[PDB]
Design a protein around this ligand. Structure first.
Ligand code: HEM
Ligand SMILES: [Xe]
Length: 116
């Protein structure tokens, strides 16, 4: 599973952590996460990706389409975050092919987060 090729639980965690960091460091999207609990965002998202990446414990949390309704996220902006995931995976040492495969799974949620 990509989850395994990636190195497991801790690997997805570390990558997600860097993911949000790269987000808050980007002016163009950092705004949506204003006054947002970052360690929680890191944890939930991690849980979510492990599941989507083939992990053991599947996703239980809220419906993402529902979570992000009326949030003002645009495709450009979503794309930008995806790039934050890609840079995060890259600086993490992930091999190119795996990066894109992980980013590919992340992209599936584009339809549930983008609303404008
Ligand atoms: C431009 C892209 C995105 C923006 C601006 C965004 C923004 C947010 C915000 C602001 C929240 C917090 C909700 C609140 O308490 O007010 C949230 C929660 C969440 N987002 Fe995103 N999000 C984006 C992309 C994603 C992606 C790509 C994923 C999947 C890796 C994702 C998964 C989640 C999850 C799991 C939660 C928490 C759901 C829960 O606790 O049940 N988000 N997002
Ligand atoms: Xe990840």
């Amino acid at each position: 599973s990509l989850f395994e090729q990636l190195g497991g639980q801790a690997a997805v965690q570390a990558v997600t952590a860097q993911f949000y960091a790269n987000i808050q460091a980007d002016a163009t999207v950092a705004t949506f996460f204003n006054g947002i609990d970052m360690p929680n965002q890191t944890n939930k998202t991690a849980a979510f990706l492990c599941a989507a990446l083939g992990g053991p414990n599947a996703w239980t949390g809220r419906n993402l389409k529902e979570v992000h309704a009326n949030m003002g996220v645009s495709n450009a902006q979503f794309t930008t975050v995806i790039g934050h995931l890609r840079s995060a995976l890259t600086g993490a040492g992930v091999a190119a092919a795996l990066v894109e495969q992980t980013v590919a799974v992340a992209e599936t949620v584009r339809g549930d987060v983008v609303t404008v």
